[PDB]
JSON list of C-alpha atoms and ligand atoms in Angstrom, two decimals:
[
{"chain": "A", "resi": 1, "resn": "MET", "atom": "CA", "xyz": [-0.02, 0.01, 0.01]},
{"chain": "A", "resi": 2, "resn": "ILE", "atom": "CA", "xyz": [1.22, 3.45, -0.94]},
{"chain": "A", "resi": 3, "resn": "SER", "atom": "CA", "xyz": [0.33, 6.51, 1.19]},
{"chain": "A", "resi": 4, "resn": "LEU", "atom": "CA", "xyz": [1.17, 10.24, 0.73]},
{"chain": "A", "resi": 5, "resn": "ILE", "atom": "CA", "xyz": [1.77, 12.50, 3.65]},
{"chain": "A", "resi": 6, "resn": "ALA", "atom": "CA", "xyz": [1.90, 16.31, 3.25]},
{"chain": "A", "resi": 7, "resn": "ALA", "atom": "CA", "xyz": [1.12, 19.61, 5.01]},
{"chain": "A", "resi": 8, "resn": "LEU", "atom": "CA", "xyz": [-0.83, 22.11, 2.94]},
{"chain": "A", "resi": 9, "resn": "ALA", "atom": "CA", "xyz": [-1.24, 25.73, 3.57]},
{"chain": "A", "resi": 10, "resn": "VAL", "atom": "CA", "xyz": [-4.02, 27.79, 1.85]},
{"chain": "A", "resi": 11, "resn": "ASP", "atom": "CA", "xyz": [-4.45, 27.05, -1.91]},
{"chain": "A", "resi": 12, "resn": "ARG", "atom": "CA", "xyz": [-2.44, 23.79, -1.51]},
{"chain": "A", "resi": 13, "resn": "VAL", "atom": "CA", "xyz": [0.84, 25.53, -1.14]},
{"chain": "A", "resi": 14, "resn": "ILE", "atom": "CA", "xyz": [3.56, 23.19, 0.10]},
{"chain": "A", "resi": 15, "resn": "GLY", "atom": "CA", "xyz": [6.80, 25.05, -0.37]},
{"chain": "A", "resi": 16, "resn": "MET", "atom": "CA", "xyz": [8.63, 28.22, -1.36]},
{"chain": "A", "resi": 17, "resn": "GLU", "atom": "CA", "xyz": [12.21, 28.42, -2.54]},
{"chain": "A", "resi": 18, "resn": "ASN", "atom": "CA", "xyz": [12.91, 24.81, -1.55]},
{"chain": "A", "resi": 19, "resn": "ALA", "atom": "CA", "xyz": [11.84, 25.35, 1.99]},
{"chain": "A", "resi": 20, "resn": "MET", "atom": "CA", "xyz": [8.74, 25.32, 4.20]},
{"chain": "A", "resi": 21, "resn": "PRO", "atom": "CA", "xyz": [8.59, 28.81, 5.83]},
{"chain": "A", "resi": 22, "resn": "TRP", "atom": "CA", "xyz": [6.33, 27.96, 8.74]},
{"chain": "A", "resi": 23, "resn": "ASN", "atom": "CA", "xyz": [7.06, 26.10, 11.92]},
{"chain": "A", "resi": 24, "resn": "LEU", "atom": "CA", "xyz": [4.44, 23.82, 13.41]},
{"chain": "A", "resi": 25, "resn": "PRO", "atom": "CA", "xyz": [6.05, 21.45, 15.88]},
{"chain": "A", "resi": 26, "resn": "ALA", "atom": "CA", "xyz": [2.70, 19.50, 16.42]},
{"chain": "A", "resi": 27, "resn": "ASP", "atom": "CA", "xyz": [2.67, 18.68, 12.71]},
{"chain": "A", "resi": 28, "resn": "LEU", "atom": "CA", "xyz": [6.27, 17.58, 12.60]},
{"chain": "A", "resi": 29, "resn": "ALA", "atom": "CA", "xyz": [5.43, 15.21, 15.57]},
{"chain": "A", "resi": 30, "resn": "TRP", "atom": "CA", "xyz": [2.43, 13.89, 13.61]},
{"chain": "A", "resi": 31, "resn": "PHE", "atom": "CA", "xyz": [4.78, 13.38, 10.60]},
{"chain": "A", "resi": 32, "resn": "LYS", "atom": "CA", "xyz": [7.22, 11.41, 12.68]},
{"chain": "A", "resi": 33, "resn": "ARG", "atom": "CA", "xyz": [4.61, 9.20, 14.38]},
{"chain": "A", "resi": 34, "resn": "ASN", "atom": "CA", "xyz": [3.00, 8.32, 11.00]},
{"chain": "A", "resi": 35, "resn": "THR", "atom": "CA", "xyz": [6.41, 7.68, 9.27]},
{"chain": "A", "resi": 36, "resn": "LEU", "atom": "CA", "xyz": [8.61, 6.00, 11.88]},
{"chain": "A", "resi": 37, "resn": "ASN", "atom": "CA", "xyz": [9.62, 2.38, 11.01]},
{"chain": "A", "resi": 38, "resn": "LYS", "atom": "CA", "xyz": [8.35, 2.75, 7.44]},
{"chain": "A", "resi": 39, "resn": "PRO", "atom": "CA", "xyz": [10.21, 3.45, 4.19]},
{"chain": "A", "resi": 40, "resn": "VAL", "atom": "CA", "xyz": [9.94, 7.05, 2.97]},
{"chain": "A", "resi": 41, "resn": "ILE", "atom": "CA", "xyz": [10.29, 8.02, -0.68]},
{"chain": "A", "resi": 42, "resn": "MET", "atom": "CA", "xyz": [11.27, 11.57, -1.59]},
{"chain": "A", "resi": 43, "resn": "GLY", "atom": "CA", "xyz": [12.47, 13.52, -4.55]},
{"chain": "A", "resi": 44, "resn": "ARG", "atom": "CA", "xyz": [15.93, 14.99, -4.76]},
{"chain": "A", "resi": 45, "resn": "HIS", "atom": "CA", "xyz": [14.81, 18.60, -3.99]},
{"chain": "A", "resi": 46, "resn": "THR", "atom": "CA", "xyz": [13.03, 17.46, -0.84]},
{"chain": "A", "resi": 47, "resn": "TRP", "atom": "CA", "xyz": [16.17, 15.52, 0.17]},
{"chain": "A", "resi": 48, "resn": "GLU", "atom": "CA", "xyz": [18.11, 18.72, -0.13]},
{"chain": "A", "resi": 49, "resn": "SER", "atom": "CA", "xyz": [15.49, 20.71, 1.86]},
{"chain": "A", "resi": 50, "resn": "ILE", "atom": "CA", "xyz": [15.55, 18.26, 4.72]},
{"chain": "A", "resi": 51, "resn": "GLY", "atom": "CA", "xyz": [19.34, 18.17, 4.61]},
{"chain": "A", "resi": 52, "resn": "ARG", "atom": "CA", "xyz": [19.97, 14.89, 6.46]},
{"chain": "A", "resi": 53, "resn": "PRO", "atom": "CA", "xyz": [18.59, 11.33, 6.65]},
{"chain": "A", "resi": 54, "resn": "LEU", "atom": "CA", "xyz": [15.39, 10.87, 8.70]},
{"chain": "A", "resi": 55, "resn": "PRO", "atom": "CA", "xyz": [16.33, 8.43, 11.53]},
{"chain": "A", "resi": 56, "resn": "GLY", "atom": "CA", "xyz": [14.41, 5.19, 12.00]},
{"chain": "A", "resi": 57, "resn": "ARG", "atom": "CA", "xyz": [13.13, 5.01, 8.38]},
{"chain": "A", "resi": 58, "resn": "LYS", "atom": "CA", "xyz": [14.58, 3.64, 5.23]},
{"chain": "A", "resi": 59, "resn": "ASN", "atom": "CA", "xyz": [15.19, 6.80, 3.13]},
{"chain": "A", "resi": 60, "resn": "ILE", "atom": "CA", "xyz": [14.76, 6.39, -0.66]},
{"chain": "A", "resi": 61, "resn": "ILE", "atom": "CA", "xyz": [15.62, 9.27, -3.01]},
{"chain": "A", "resi": 62, "resn": "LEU", "atom": "CA", "xyz": [14.39, 9.55, -6.55]},
{"chain": "A", "resi": 63, "resn": "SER", "atom": "CA", "xyz": [16.95, 11.20, -8.94]},
{"chain": "A", "resi": 64, "resn": "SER", "atom": "CA", "xyz": [17.85, 10.73, -12.57]},
{"chain": "A", "resi": 65, "resn": "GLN", "atom": "CA", "xyz": [21.49, 11.21, -11.58]},
{"chain": "A", "resi": 66, "resn": "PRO", "atom": "CA", "xyz": [23.86, 9.08, -9.46]},
{"chain": "A", "resi": 67, "resn": "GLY", "atom": "CA", "xyz": [23.50, 9.32, -5.79]},
{"chain": "A", "resi": 68, "resn": "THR", "atom": "CA", "xyz": [25.95, 11.36, -3.71]},
{"chain": "A", "resi": 69, "resn": "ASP", "atom": "CA", "xyz": [25.42, 9.90, -0.21]},
{"chain": "A", "resi": 70, "resn": "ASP", "atom": "CA", "xyz": [25.48, 6.22, 0.78]},
{"chain": "A", "resi": 71, "resn": "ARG", "atom": "CA", "xyz": [23.48, 6.80, 3.96]},
{"chain": "A", "resi": 72, "resn": "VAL", "atom": "CA", "xyz": [20.30, 6.67, 1.82]},
{"chain": "A", "resi": 73, "resn": "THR", "atom": "CA", "xyz": [19.06, 4.61, -1.13]},
{"chain": "A", "resi": 74, "resn": "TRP", "atom": "CA", "xyz": [19.01, 6.18, -4.58]},
{"chain": "A", "resi": 75, "resn": "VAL", "atom": "CA", "xyz": [16.73, 5.06, -7.31]},
{"chain": "A", "resi": 76, "resn": "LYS", "atom": "CA", "xyz": [16.01, 6.24, -10.91]},
{"chain": "A", "resi": 77, "resn": "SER", "atom": "CA", "xyz": [12.27, 5.50, -11.41]},
{"chain": "A", "resi": 78, "resn": "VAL", "atom": "CA", "xyz": [8.98, 5.14, -9.59]},
{"chain": "A", "resi": 79, "resn": "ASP", "atom": "CA", "xyz": [8.91, 1.35, -10.09]},
{"chain": "A", "resi": 80, "resn": "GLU", "atom": "CA", "xyz": [12.46, 1.00, -8.72]},
{"chain": "A", "resi": 81, "resn": "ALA", "atom": "CA", "xyz": [11.52, 3.16, -5.64]},
{"chain": "A", "resi": 82, "resn": "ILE", "atom": "CA", "xyz": [8.62, 0.89, -4.86]},
{"chain": "A", "resi": 83, "resn": "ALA", "atom": "CA", "xyz": [10.75, -2.30, -5.28]},
{"chain": "A", "resi": 84, "resn": "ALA", "atom": "CA", "xyz": [13.50, -0.91, -3.05]},
{"chain": "A", "resi": 85, "resn": "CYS", "atom": "CA", "xyz": [10.92, -0.72, -0.15]},
{"chain": "A", "resi": 86, "resn": "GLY", "atom": "CA", "xyz": [10.48, -4.47, -0.17]},
{"chain": "A", "resi": 87, "resn": "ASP", "atom": "CA", "xyz": [7.43, -6.27, 1.15]},
{"chain": "A", "resi": 88, "resn": "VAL", "atom": "CA", "xyz": [6.20, -3.86, 3.75]},
{"chain": "A", "resi": 89, "resn": "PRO", "atom": "CA", "xyz": [2.62, -3.04, 4.68]},
{"chain": "A", "resi": 90, "resn": "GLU", "atom": "CA", "xyz": [2.78, 0.74, 3.94]},
{"chain": "A", "resi": 91, "resn": "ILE", "atom": "CA", "xyz": [5.11, 2.88, 1.92]},
{"chain": "A", "resi": 92, "resn": "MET", "atom": "CA", "xyz": [5.15, 6.62, 2.74]},
{"chain": "A", "resi": 93, "resn": "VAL", "atom": "CA", "xyz": [5.70, 9.12, -0.03]},
{"chain": "A", "resi": 94, "resn": "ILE", "atom": "CA", "xyz": [6.85, 12.46, 1.57]},
{"chain": "A", "resi": 95, "resn": "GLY", "atom": "CA", "xyz": [7.06, 14.71, -1.52]},
{"chain": "A", "resi": 96, "resn": "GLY", "atom": "CA", "xyz": [7.73, 17.13, -3.09]},
{"chain": "A", "resi": 97, "resn": "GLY", "atom": "CA", "xyz": [5.31, 18.33, -5.62]},
{"chain": "A", "resi": 98, "resn": "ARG", "atom": "CA", "xyz": [6.58, 16.45, -8.62]},
{"chain": "A", "resi": 99, "resn": "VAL", "atom": "CA", "xyz": [6.87, 13.23, -6.63]},
{"chain": "A", "resi": 100, "resn": "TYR", "atom": "CA", "xyz": [3.34, 13.58, -5.20]},
{"chain": "A", "resi": 101, "resn": "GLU", "atom": "CA", "xyz": [1.96, 14.02, -8.73]},
{"chain": "A", "resi": 102, "resn": "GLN", "atom": "CA", "xyz": [3.58, 10.66, -9.82]},
{"chain": "A", "resi": 103, "resn": "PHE", "atom": "CA", "xyz": [2.43, 8.66, -6.74]},
{"chain": "A", "resi": 104, "resn": "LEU", "atom": "CA", "xyz": [-1.06, 10.01, -6.33]},
{"chain": "A", "resi": 105, "resn": "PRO", "atom": "CA", "xyz": [-2.71, 7.63, -8.87]},
{"chain": "A", "resi": 106, "resn": "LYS", "atom": "CA", "xyz": [-1.10, 4.66, -7.05]},
{"chain": "A", "resi": 107, "resn": "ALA", "atom": "CA", "xyz": [-1.98, 5.82, -3.56]},
{"chain": "A", "resi": 108, "resn": "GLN", "atom": "CA", "xyz": [-4.66, 4.30, -1.28]},
{"chain": "A", "resi": 109, "resn": "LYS", "atom": "CA", "xyz": [-4.32, 6.80, 1.62]},
{"chain": "A", "resi": 110, "resn": "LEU", "atom": "CA", "xyz": [-3.61, 10.52, 2.19]},
{"chain": "A", "resi": 111, "resn": "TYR", "atom": "CA", "xyz": [-2.43, 11.91, 5.51]},
{"chain": "A", "resi": 112, "resn": "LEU", "atom": "CA", "xyz": [-2.94, 15.67, 5.09]},
{"chain": "A", "resi": 113, "resn": "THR", "atom": "CA", "xyz": [-2.43, 18.55, 7.45]},
{"chain": "A", "resi": 114, "resn": "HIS", "atom": "CA", "xyz": [-4.46, 21.59, 6.57]},
{"chain": "A", "resi": 115, "resn": "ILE", "atom": "CA", "xyz": [-2.69, 24.67, 7.93]},
{"chain": "A", "resi": 116, "resn": "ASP", "atom": "CA", "xyz": [-4.59, 27.99, 8.26]},
{"chain": "A", "resi": 117, "resn": "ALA", "atom": "CA", "xyz": [-1.82, 30.04, 6.90]},
{"chain": "A", "resi": 118, "resn": "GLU", "atom": "CA", "xyz": [-1.56, 32.14, 3.71]},
{"chain": "A", "resi": 119, "resn": "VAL", "atom": "CA", "xyz": [1.85, 31.34, 2.13]},
{"chain": "A", "resi": 120, "resn": "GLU", "atom": "CA", "xyz": [3.28, 32.69, -1.05]},
{"chain": "A", "resi": 121, "resn": "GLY", "atom": "CA", "xyz": [4.66, 29.57, -2.66]},
{"chain": "A", "resi": 122, "resn": "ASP", "atom": "CA", "xyz": [6.07, 28.00, -5.83]},
{"chain": "A", "resi": 123, "resn": "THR", "atom": "CA", "xyz": [5.08, 24.34, -5.17]},
{"chain": "A", "resi": 124, "resn": "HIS", "atom": "CA", "xyz": [1.62, 22.93, -4.67]},
{"chain": "A", "resi": 125, "resn": "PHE", "atom": "CA", "xyz": [0.11, 19.62, -3.77]},
{"chain": "A", "resi": 126, "resn": "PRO", "atom": "CA", "xyz": [-1.64, 17.97, -6.77]},
{"chain": "A", "resi": 127, "resn": "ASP", "atom": "CA", "xyz": [-5.22, 18.72, -7.46]},
{"chain": "A", "resi": 128, "resn": "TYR", "atom": "CA", "xyz": [-6.98, 15.64, -6.20]},
{"chain": "A", "resi": 129, "resn": "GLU", "atom": "CA", "xyz": [-10.48, 14.70, -7.24]},
{"chain": "A", "resi": 130, "resn": "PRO", "atom": "CA", "xyz": [-12.52, 14.91, -4.04]},
{"chain": "A", "resi": 131, "resn": "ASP", "atom": "CA", "xyz": [-15.06, 12.28, -5.11]},
{"chain": "A", "resi": 132, "resn": "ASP", "atom": "CA", "xyz": [-12.39, 9.66, -5.13]},
{"chain": "A", "resi": 133, "resn": "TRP", "atom": "CA", "xyz": [-11.58, 9.90, -1.32]},
{"chain": "A", "resi": 134, "resn": "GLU", "atom": "CA", "xyz": [-13.36, 9.29, 1.89]},
{"chain": "A", "resi": 135, "resn": "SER", "atom": "CA", "xyz": [-12.48, 11.16, 5.01]},
{"chain": "A", "resi": 136, "resn": "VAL", "atom": "CA", "xyz": [-11.88, 8.58, 7.79]},
{"chain": "A", "resi": 137, "resn": "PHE", "atom": "CA", "xyz": [-10.26, 10.81, 10.46]},
{"chain": "A", "resi": 138, "resn": "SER", "atom": "CA", "xyz": [-10.10, 14.44, 11.14]},
{"chain": "A", "resi": 139, "resn": "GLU", "atom": "CA", "xyz": [-8.81, 16.39, 14.16]},
{"chain": "A", "resi": 140, "resn": "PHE", "atom": "CA", "xyz": [-8.86, 20.19, 14.49]},
{"chain": "A", "resi": 141, "resn": "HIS", "atom": "CA", "xyz": [-6.46, 22.15, 16.69]},
{"chain": "A", "resi": 142, "resn": "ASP", "atom": "CA", "xyz": [-6.50, 25.86, 17.50]},
{"chain": "A", "resi": 143, "resn": "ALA", "atom": "CA", "xyz": [-3.22, 27.76, 17.53]},
{"chain": "A", "resi": 144, "resn": "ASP", "atom": "CA", "xyz": [-1.30, 27.72, 20.88]},
{"chain": "A", "resi": 145, "resn": "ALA", "atom": "CA", "xyz": [1.96, 29.03, 22.35]},
{"chain": "A", "resi": 146, "resn": "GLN", "atom": "CA", "xyz": [3.95, 26.48, 20.33]},
{"chain": "A", "resi": 147, "resn": "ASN", "atom": "CA", "xyz": [1.89, 26.32, 17.11]},
{"chain": "A", "resi": 148, "resn": "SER", "atom": "CA", "xyz": [1.16, 29.71, 15.62]},
{"chain": "A", "resi": 149, "resn": "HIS", "atom": "CA", "xyz": [-1.59, 28.68, 13.20]},
{"chain": "A", "resi": 150, "resn": "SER", "atom": "CA", "xyz": [-4.60, 26.52, 13.54]},
{"chain": "A", "resi": 151, "resn": "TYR", "atom": "CA", "xyz": [-4.37, 23.13, 11.77]},
{"chain": "A", "resi": 152, "resn": "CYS", "atom": "CA", "xyz": [-6.43, 20.08, 10.85]},
{"chain": "A", "resi": 153, "resn": "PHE", "atom": "CA", "xyz": [-5.05, 16.53, 10.63]},
{"chain": "A", "resi": 154, "resn": "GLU", "atom": "CA", "xyz": [-7.06, 14.44, 8.15]},
{"chain": "A", "resi": 155, "resn": "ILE", "atom": "CA", "xyz": [-6.73, 10.90, 6.84]},
{"chain": "A", "resi": 156, "resn": "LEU", "atom": "CA", "xyz": [-8.47, 10.01, 3.50]},
{"chain": "A", "resi": 157, "resn": "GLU", "atom": "CA", "xyz": [-8.79, 6.71, 1.96]},
{"chain": "A", "resi": 158, "resn": "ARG", "atom": "CA", "xyz": [-9.46, 5.99, -1.73]},
{"chain": "A", "resi": 159, "resn": "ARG", "atom": "CA", "xyz": [-13.11, 4.91, -2.10]},
{"chain": "B", "resi": 201, "resn": "NAP", "atom": "N1", "xyz": [4.61, 20.74, 2.93]},
{"chain": "B", "resi": 201, "resn": "NAP", "atom": "C1", "xyz": [4.98, 19.52, 2.69]},
{"chain": "B", "resi": 201, "resn": "NAP", "atom": "O1", "xyz": [4.31, 18.58, 2.99]},
{"chain": "B", "resi": 201, "resn": "NAP", "atom": "C2", "xyz": [6.15, 19.20, 1.82]},
{"chain": "B", "resi": 201, "resn": "NAP", "atom": "C3", "xyz": [6.56, 17.94, 1.58]},
{"chain": "B", "resi": 201, "resn": "NAP", "atom": "C4", "xyz": [7.70, 17.72, 0.82]},
{"chain": "B", "resi": 201, "resn": "NAP", "atom": "C5", "xyz": [8.31, 18.73, 0.13]},
{"chain": "B", "resi": 201, "resn": "NAP", "atom": "N2", "xyz": [7.87, 20.05, 0.35]},
{"chain": "B", "resi": 201, "resn": "NAP", "atom": "C6", "xyz": [8.42, 21.13, -0.37]},
{"chain": "B", "resi": 201, "resn": "NAP", "atom": "O2", "xyz": [8.37, 20.73, -1.77]},
{"chain": "B", "resi": 201, "resn": "NAP", "atom": "C7", "xyz": [9.39, 21.44, -2.52]},
{"chain": "B", "resi": 201, "resn": "NAP", "atom": "C8", "xyz": [10.16, 20.47, -3.36]},
{"chain": "B", "resi": 201, "resn": "NAP", "atom": "O3", "xyz": [9.21, 19.91, -4.31]},
{"chain": "B", "resi": 201, "resn": "NAP", "atom": "P1", "xyz": [9.67, 19.83, -5.89]},
{"chain": "B", "resi": 201, "resn": "NAP", "atom": "O4", "xyz": [8.38, 19.54, -6.61]},
{"chain": "B", "resi": 201, "resn": "NAP", "atom": "O5", "xyz": [10.48, 20.98, -6.28]},
{"chain": "B", "resi": 201, "resn": "NAP", "atom": "O6", "xyz": [10.72, 18.63, -5.90]},
{"chain": "B", "resi": 201, "resn": "NAP", "atom": "P2", "xyz": [10.65, 17.06, -5.54]},
{"chain": "B", "resi": 201, "resn": "NAP", "atom": "O7", "xyz": [9.40, 16.43, -6.01]},
{"chain": "B", "resi": 201, "resn": "NAP", "atom": "O8", "xyz": [11.10, 16.98, -4.09]},
{"chain": "B", "resi": 201, "resn": "NAP", "atom": "O9", "xyz": [12.01, 16.60, -6.27]},
{"chain": "B", "resi": 201, "resn": "NAP", "atom": "C9", "xyz": [11.97, 16.52, -7.73]},
{"chain": "B", "resi": 201, "resn": "NAP", "atom": "C10", "xyz": [13.22, 15.84, -8.20]},
{"chain": "B", "resi": 201, "resn": "NAP", "atom": "O10", "xyz": [13.06, 14.43, -7.85]},
{"chain": "B", "resi": 201, "resn": "NAP", "atom": "C11", "xyz": [13.61, 13.67, -8.91]},
{"chain": "B", "resi": 201, "resn": "NAP", "atom": "N3", "xyz": [12.59, 12.82, -9.51]},
{"chain": "B", "resi": 201, "resn": "NAP", "atom": "C12", "xyz": [11.21, 13.00, -9.39]},
{"chain": "B", "resi": 201, "resn": "NAP", "atom": "N4", "xyz": [10.51, 12.08, -9.97]},
{"chain": "B", "resi": 201, "resn": "NAP", "atom": "C13", "xyz": [11.51, 11.20, -10.59]},
{"chain": "B", "resi": 201, "resn": "NAP", "atom": "C14", "xyz": [11.50, 10.09, -11.44]},
{"chain": "B", "resi": 201, "resn": "NAP", "atom": "N5", "xyz": [10.22, 9.54, -11.76]},
{"chain": "B", "resi": 201, "resn": "NAP", "atom": "N6", "xyz": [12.59, 9.54, -11.73]},
{"chain": "B", "resi": 201, "resn": "NAP", "atom": "C15", "xyz": [13.73, 10.06, -11.38]},
{"chain": "B", "resi": 201, "resn": "NAP", "atom": "N7", "xyz": [13.87, 11.15, -10.66]},
{"chain": "B", "resi": 201, "resn": "NAP", "atom": "C16", "xyz": [12.76, 11.72, -10.28]},
{"chain": "B", "resi": 201, "resn": "NAP", "atom": "C17", "xyz": [14.24, 14.57, -9.89]},
{"chain": "B", "resi": 201, "resn": "NAP", "atom": "O11", "xyz": [15.63, 14.76, -9.47]},
{"chain": "B", "resi": 201, "resn": "NAP", "atom": "P3", "xyz": [16.77, 15.04, -10.54]},
{"chain": "B", "resi": 201, "resn": "NAP", "atom": "O12", "xyz": [16.64, 16.56, -11.01]},
{"chain": "B", "resi": 201, "resn": "NAP", "atom": "O13", "xyz": [18.01, 14.79, -9.71]},
{"chain": "B", "resi": 201, "resn": "NAP", "atom": "O14", "xyz": [16.60, 14.00, -11.64]},
{"chain": "B", "resi": 201, "resn": "NAP", "atom": "C18", "xyz": [13.46, 15.85, -9.70]},
{"chain": "B", "resi": 201, "resn": "NAP", "atom": "O15", "xyz": [14.10, 17.07, -10.11]},
{"chain": "B", "resi": 201, "resn": "NAP", "atom": "C19", "xyz": [10.27, 22.22, -1.44]},
{"chain": "B", "resi": 201, "resn": "NAP", "atom": "O16", "xyz": [9.76, 23.56, -1.33]},
{"chain": "B", "resi": 201, "resn": "NAP", "atom": "C20", "xyz": [9.92, 21.45, -0.16]},
{"chain": "B", "resi": 201, "resn": "NAP", "atom": "O17", "xyz": [10.10, 22.21, 0.94]},
{"chain": "B", "resi": 201, "resn": "NAP", "atom": "C21", "xyz": [6.82, 20.23, 1.10]},
{"chain": "B", "resi": 202, "resn": "FOL", "atom": "N1", "xyz": [2.47, 16.85, 7.72]},
{"chain": "B", "resi": 202, "resn": "FOL", "atom": "C1", "xyz": [3.65, 16.97, 7.23]},
{"chain": "B", "resi": 202, "resn": "FOL", "atom": "N2", "xyz": [4.40, 17.90, 7.68]},
{"chain": "B", "resi": 202, "resn": "FOL", "atom": "C2", "xyz": [5.63, 18.13, 7.31]},
{"chain": "B", "resi": 202, "resn": "FOL", "atom": "O1", "xyz": [6.32, 19.08, 7.75]},
{"chain": "B", "resi": 202, "resn": "FOL", "atom": "C3", "xyz": [6.10, 17.35, 6.17]},
{"chain": "B", "resi": 202, "resn": "FOL", "atom": "N3", "xyz": [7.37, 17.53, 5.66]},
{"chain": "B", "resi": 202, "resn": "FOL", "atom": "C4", "xyz": [7.75, 16.79, 4.63]},
{"chain": "B", "resi": 202, "resn": "FOL", "atom": "C5", "xyz": [9.07, 16.97, 4.10]},
{"chain": "B", "resi": 202, "resn": "FOL", "atom": "N4", "xyz": [10.04, 17.81, 5.00]},
{"chain": "B", "resi": 202, "resn": "FOL", "atom": "C6", "xyz": [10.45, 17.51, 6.27]},
{"chain": "B", "resi": 202, "resn": "FOL", "atom": "C7", "xyz": [11.22, 18.41, 7.01]},
{"chain": "B", "resi": 202, "resn": "FOL", "atom": "C8", "xyz": [11.57, 18.10, 8.30]},
{"chain": "B", "resi": 202, "resn": "FOL", "atom": "C9", "xyz": [11.27, 16.87, 8.87]},
{"chain": "B", "resi": 202, "resn": "FOL", "atom": "C10", "xyz": [11.76, 16.58, 10.23]},
{"chain": "B", "resi": 202, "resn": "FOL", "atom": "O2", "xyz": [12.63, 17.28, 10.80]},
{"chain": "B", "resi": 202, "resn": "FOL", "atom": "N5", "xyz": [11.19, 15.51, 10.82]},
{"chain": "B", "resi": 202, "resn": "FOL", "atom": "C11", "xyz": [11.57, 15.00, 12.15]},
{"chain": "B", "resi": 202, "resn": "FOL", "atom": "C12", "xyz": [10.76, 15.64, 13.21]},
{"chain": "B", "resi": 202, "resn": "FOL", "atom": "C13", "xyz": [10.46, 14.97, 14.47]},
{"chain": "B", "resi": 202, "resn": "FOL", "atom": "C14", "xyz": [9.68, 15.87, 15.42]},
{"chain": "B", "resi": 202, "resn": "FOL", "atom": "O3", "xyz": [9.66, 17.08, 15.26]},
{"chain": "B", "resi": 202, "resn": "FOL", "atom": "O4", "xyz": [9.00, 15.33, 16.48]},
{"chain": "B", "resi": 202, "resn": "FOL", "atom": "C15", "xyz": [11.32, 13.51, 12.00]},
{"chain": "B", "resi": 202, "resn": "FOL", "atom": "O5", "xyz": [12.11, 12.64, 12.68]},
{"chain": "B", "resi": 202, "resn": "FOL", "atom": "O6", "xyz": [10.48, 13.10, 11.25]},
{"chain": "B", "resi": 202, "resn": "FOL", "atom": "C16", "xyz": [10.51, 15.95, 8.08]},
{"chain": "B", "resi": 202, "resn": "FOL", "atom": "C17", "xyz": [10.10, 16.24, 6.82]},
{"chain": "B", "resi": 202, "resn": "FOL", "atom": "C18", "xyz": [6.84, 15.87, 4.11]},
{"chain": "B", "resi": 202, "resn": "FOL", "atom": "N6", "xyz": [5.65, 15.68, 4.58]},
{"chain": "B", "resi": 202, "resn": "FOL", "atom": "C19", "xyz": [5.25, 16.43, 5.67]},
{"chain": "B", "resi": 202, "resn": "FOL", "atom": "N7", "xyz": [3.93, 16.21, 6.09]},
{"chain": "B", "resi": 203, "resn": "MN", "atom": "MN1", "xyz": [10.87, 1.43, -15.96]},
{"chain": "B", "resi": 204, "resn": "MN", "atom": "MN1", "xyz": [7.36, -8.13, -3.24]},
{"chain": "B", "resi": 205, "resn": "MN", "atom": "MN1", "xyz": [-2.88, 31.54, 10.28]}
]
C-alpha cells in the first residue's frame, strides 16, 4: 500500500524556494509518528531541503542522476523506488510536488495537514478529485503557544 503525507497551507501551497517557511511542531510530531519504522520516498529537491537522513526510516531518494550519499538509497524510477521498499505494509511518499503528482494515482491513503496560513509559494500539492476519497479521520487544533496557526489533521482513503 502506498500513502502520501503532506502539510498544505492555503491554496495547496507546500513550499517556497525549496523550504517550508512555517514552523508547526505539532505537525512535525504527527509526521514522525506516521512515518517512523516505514520506508519514505522523496524527490531529490526534498532531500536537499531536509538536509539529512530521517532516522528510524529507510530513506529512498528519486533522482535521474547518480547518488551522492550512501546513508540513503538512490533510485531512478517510480517502479524502482517501490521495489526498493521491499514487502512492507505501507510505503510513505513524503514529496515534493513532482513526486506527489507521480504517486497520487497509485496511492490508497492520504495523510494531510491543513494549515490555516496564507503562504506565497512556488510548489503545490496535486489537485486531487474529491469524489475519489473518503475522510476517515479528522482532528482540528487551535493555535497555541507552540503552534502559531490552527491546523487540521485528516486521513483520507481511496473509495
Ligand atoms: N509541505 C509539505 O508537506 C512538503 C513535503 C515535501 C516537500 N515540500 C516542499 O516541496 C518542494 C520540493 O518539491 P519539488 O516538486 O520541487 O521537488 P521534488 O518532488 O522533491 O523533487 C523533484 C526531483 O526528484 C527527482 N525525480 C522525481 N521524479 C523522478 C522520477 N520519476 N525519476 C527520477 N527522478 C525523479 C528529480 O531529481 P533530478 O533533478 O536529480 O533527476 C526531480 O528534479 C520544497 O519547497 C519542499 O520544501 C513540502
Ligand atoms: N504533515 C507533514 N508535515 C511536514 O512538515 C512534512 N514535511 C515533509 C518533508 N520535509 C520535512 C522536513 C523536516 C522533517 C523533520 O525534521 N522530521 C523529524 C521531526 C520529529 C519531530 O519534530 O517530532 C522526523 O524525525 O520526522 C521531516 C520532513 C513531508 N511531509 C510532511 N507532512
Ligand atoms: Mn521502468
Ligand atoms: Mn514483493
Ligand atoms: Mn494563520
